[PDB]
From Swiss-Prot:
Gene that produces this protein: recA
Protein name as annotated: Protein RecA
Species this chain originates from: Mycolicibacterium smegmatis (strain ATCC 700084 / mc(2)155)
Lineage: Bacteria, Bacillati, Actinomycetota, Actinomycetes, Mycobacteriales
Alphabetized UniProt keyword annotations: ATP-binding, Cytoplasm, DNA damage, DNA recombination, DNA repair, DNA-binding, Nucleotide-binding, SOS response
InterPro entries tied to this protein: AAA+_ATPase, DNA_recomb/repair_RecA, DNA_recomb/repair_RecA_CS, P-loop_NTPase, RecA-like_C, RecA-like_N, RecA_ATP-bd, RecA_C_sf
Binding site for ATP: S67, S68, G69, K70, T71, T72, D98, P99, E100, Y101
Length: 322
């Protein structure tokens, strides 16, 4: 009488109809809902997400230690959203943002809303007010930790020293998500997890997110033996719109953003478009140079190649039709 796959498809169906598409899913599954998305600025991370980038109208949490490449992504995400003619807001609570570096990643700074809240309540509340005007495509809150409650800010005693900063973050997200879905704004929270919850407030963010990225630093790019950039490693630990747990890597050169050419090489090799004699890179017969850097340089100067490689890697995977 029983047929496990039949009874299982049925189960899953009911499950998703009760809690939302993606509440349960086979990892090897290949999602075909192309969503609305905001390119991460990293082809690999975009593919890692399985949907081409950050989903729209969702709470995204990008965590990791200082200098791991988080902000940069966050910024690239803002740049891509703006080229699509979208409006961006930046709830700054750290006062670190280097707009000069931002423009370099393609961000139109003169049109970027910025706010520098006095208290945690304020910060979130200002983000909420903006979000629910449906004008914004993306909003970035720098530093989950920085959202300290007002009571703590103003001199207030070690009396009523409850876990209020996390309750703060729960109530705020309880109501913002609603707006975020209707508005379609993607909200990236930047949780610098460094130095019981991930920064006190990220405990409630662990559940409200639709996507959580574990940004980490893994190597220092040198080519020979000198300071150039660093290779980041992102892990999609949570993904409610596609099979989670995938991993993507990329290079961020000092003063520049996520290296396109760099990626192209990586993405290329793992897909046999570009062959890597051991320590020499080549493409369709053409020699790119020894050392990932000479090739990087090669592809930067020979804009024609790279562009056809991007084509091939894209053709094979996505950013296409549906
Ligand atoms: N203001 C800046 N000027 C030059 N390079 C920067 C700047 N900000 C970030 N970078 C580059 O981006 C890399 C990652 O930094 P970032 O992602 O901003 O730190 P975090 O992980 O705290 O967000 C840095 O190692 C550097 O290569």
């Amino acid at each position: 009488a029983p047929d496990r796959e039949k009874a299982l498809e049925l189960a899953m169906a009911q499950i998703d109809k009760n809690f939302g598409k993606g509440s349960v899913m086979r990892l090897g599954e290949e999602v075909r809902q192309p969503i609305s998305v905001i390119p991460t600025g990293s082809i690999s991370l975009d593919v890692a997400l399985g949907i081409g980038g950050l989903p729209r109208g969702r709470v995204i949490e990008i965590y990791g230690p200082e200098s791991s490449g988080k902000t940069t992504v966050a910024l690239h995400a803002v740049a891509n959203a703006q080229a699509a003619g979208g409006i961006a807001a930046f709830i700054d609570a750290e006062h670190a943002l280097d707009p000069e570096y931002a423009k370099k990643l393609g961000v139109d700074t003169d049109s970027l809303l910025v706010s520098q809240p006095d208290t945690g309540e304020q910060a979130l509340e200002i983000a909420d007010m903006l979000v629910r005007s449906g004008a914004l495509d993306i909003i970035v809150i720098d530093s989950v930790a920085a959202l300290v409650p007002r009571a703590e800010i103003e001199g207030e005693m070690g009396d009523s020293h409850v876990g209020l900063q996390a309750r703060l973050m729960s109530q705020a997200l309880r109501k913002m998500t609603g707006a975020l879905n209707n508005s379609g704004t993607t909200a990236i929270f930047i949780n610098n997890l460094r130095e019981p919850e991930t920064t006190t407030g990220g405990k409630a963010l662990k559940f409200y997110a639709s996507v959580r990225l574990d940004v980490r630093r893994i190597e220092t790019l040198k080519d020979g033996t000198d300071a150039v950039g660093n290779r980041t490693r992102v892990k999609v630990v949570k993904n409610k719109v596609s099979p989670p747990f995938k991993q993507a890597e990329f290079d961020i050169l000092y003063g520049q953003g996520i290296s396109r050419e760099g990626s192209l090489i990586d993405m290329g090799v793992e897909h046999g478009f570009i062959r890597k004699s051991g320590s020499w890179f080549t493409y369709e017969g053409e020699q790119l140079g020894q050392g990932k850097e000479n090739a990087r340089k090669f592809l930067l100067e020979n804009t024609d190649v790279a562009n056809e490689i991007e084509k091939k890697i894209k053709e094979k995977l996505g950013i296409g039709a549906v």
